[PDB]
Design a protein around this ligand. Sequence first.
Ligand SMILES: Cc1cc2nc3c(=O)[nH]c(=O)nc-3n(C[C@H](O)[C@H](O)[C@H](O)COP(=O)(O)OP(=O)(O)OC[C@H]3O[C@@H](n4cnc5c(N)ncnc54)[C@H](O)[C@@H]3O)c2cc1C
Ligand SMILES: Cc1cc2nc3c(=O)[nH]c(=O)nc-3n(C[C@H](O)[C@H](O)[C@H](O)COP(=O)(O)OP(=O)(O)OC[C@H]3O[C@@H](n4cnc5c(N)ncnc54)[C@H](O)[C@@H]3O)c2cc1C
Ligand SMILES: CN(C)c1ccc2cc3ccc(N(C)C)cc3[nH+]c2c1
Ligand SMILES: CN(C)c1ccc2cc3ccc(N(C)C)cc3[nH+]c2c1
Ligand SMILES: [Zn+2]
Ligand SMILES: [Zn+2]
Ligand SMILES: [Zn+2]
Lengths: 230, 230
Amino acid sequence: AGKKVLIVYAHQEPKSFNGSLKNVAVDELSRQGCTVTVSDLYAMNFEPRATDKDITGTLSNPEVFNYGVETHEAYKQRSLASDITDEQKKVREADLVIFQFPLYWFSVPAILKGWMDRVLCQGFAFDIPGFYDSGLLQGKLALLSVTTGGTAEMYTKTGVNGDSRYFLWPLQHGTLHFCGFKVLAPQISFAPEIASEEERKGMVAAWSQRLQTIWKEEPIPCTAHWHFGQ
Amino acid sequence: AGKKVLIVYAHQEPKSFNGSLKNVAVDELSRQGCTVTVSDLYAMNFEPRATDKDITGTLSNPEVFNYGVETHEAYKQRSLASDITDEQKKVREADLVIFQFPLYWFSVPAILKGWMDRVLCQGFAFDIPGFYDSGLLQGKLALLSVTTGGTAEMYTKTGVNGDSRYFLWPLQHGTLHFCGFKVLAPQISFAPEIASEEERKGMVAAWSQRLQTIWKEEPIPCTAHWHFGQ
Ligand SMILES: Cc1cc2nc3c(=O)[nH]c(=O)nc-3n(C[C@H](O)[C@H](O)[C@H](O)COP(=O)(O)OP(=O)(O)OC[C@H]3O[C@@H](n4cnc5c(N)ncnc54)[C@H](O)[C@@H]3O)c2cc1C
Ligand SMILES: Cc1cc2nc3c(=O)[nH]c(=O)nc-3n(C[C@H](O)[C@H](O)[C@H](O)COP(=O)(O)OP(=O)(O)OC[C@H]3O[C@@H](n4cnc5c(N)ncnc54)[C@H](O)[C@@H]3O)c2cc1C
Ligand SMILES: CN(C)c1ccc2cc3ccc(N(C)C)cc3[nH+]c2c1
Ligand SMILES: CN(C)c1ccc2cc3ccc(N(C)C)cc3[nH+]c2c1
Ligand SMILES: [Zn+2]
Ligand SMILES: [Zn+2]
Ligand SMILES: [Zn+2]
């Protein structure tokens, strides 16, 4: 029961609520004896754009650039940019990948979207065929730890934003499940800006507490029914 | 007449199918006498990361960086970076905003997500609170023109990918509707890489043909029911 964790962290400010959730994750998983690695995207100035700079080798078709085709071939040839293969090594070795981020437009901040776009390339994360339950990262776990501006009540079916699970679909299903991850239940820390100091400390403590038993959890059924109901 | 269009375009390759869709849109809207502007994000090397470089001069709190607050104040104090305010001017002047992009992980490519994150800032596109039917860009139209790897069949409710409408929710509702756009029906060009020339030119012509009467269209009811309901 020796475990490796990658935290992909997307916040600009170390003193932020996200930074605290990231740090208690590092603290608690470290205390357990886990191997822990953090990719601090903003601190890394992580490149989010999918461009032809991501391939350094002879292009398969230099007249008409197809990012998917060229990165697939570059992965197989090992001519991807090294910032991509650095992240792939971290994912390959991880048993659990935690994404820590504030919700930006019902999704991840663009710098984290770029990580998904560039790191989870064909050949590495998935193949055609070889996706969803046949994805190449099968046997791994993923978990979204998300913070919001909106309260829990705003993110219910009858709330203004609709149920929180609705916006998880592209991330949990379209991305992580597609690559073969099993998905642990999301951690959603609602509206820390609006919360009291007590409620904030409580949300941080609840995450730390959950982490104590994270390795005993079962994943969600990452299906349309789970996300949207009947 | 007298209508103004902004096309926010996110593809690396001018010869691409996305490129062709953008070009027929320019051609047809120009033919109609519309005012047309294109933001070619990759050609612009558009910055996707939400950072403290987005505010010029002195920060509202140089000790603890809060992107939302700093950009809200910067917008009010006319102290945003020029790449952002250049885009805001285009959006302000536009009656219709078309987004042309390939589907990346059930969402927009990160460079376009960064446009959404950085351009549609608090004070300009929405305020806390000032939003959904009351967002700050009310009166404007928006339209997603999306290309996919997956075939139309794969994007059915019981299909592996689920209904294409499921992944539109964060884009049409959580972003565009929230900023006050009325949302025209999406243009989805399914699986051009797999399609024949016949089908590919048909899809380009469907788009060109649709643009002929775009100004007559009713917007969708951008509701949970439209996206998820039967
Ligand atoms: C472009 C953009 C798009 C957005 N889109 C959405 C959206 O679609 N939906 C939505 O709901 N929201 C949205 N938001 C709002 C955003 O999700 C929230 O502002 C964000 O989740 C807040 O998290 P944070 O870490 O930045 O909070 P912070 O501002 O850092 O934290 C709140 C307070 O917690 C304090 N704190 C930090 N650590 C601790 C600790 N250990 N104990 C106690 N207090 C602590 C901090 O000092 C701070 O005062 C958007 C914001 C932006 C900029
Ligand atoms: C990181 C990443 C994530 C992705 N995630 C998803 C996902 O979640 N879901 C999904 O379904 N797909 C996904 N895809 C696949 C992606 O959406 C498709 O590859 C893309 O939409 C194809 O569009 P294109 O413009 O790039 O096609 P192209 O390869 O440029 O075009 C297809 C063909 O059309 C030809 N063509 C160009 N102009 C014309 C014209 N005028 N008439 C006729 N033919 C023409 C081109 O020469 C080309 O041969 C992903 C891809 C990547 C790289
Ligand atoms: C300080 N607080 C409470 C904030 C600050 C910024 C915010 C930005 C948002 C952007 C989109 C959105 N939706 C699409 C729901 C909700 C947002 N809520 C916010 C709440
Ligand atoms: C999340 N989902 C459904 C995805 C994710 C990535 C994808 C990448 C692709 C690359 C080429 C291709 N073709 C050439 C057909 C089809 C692809 N379909 C994808 C579907
Ligand atoms: Zn799933
Ligand atoms: Zn304001
Ligand atoms: Zn809506």
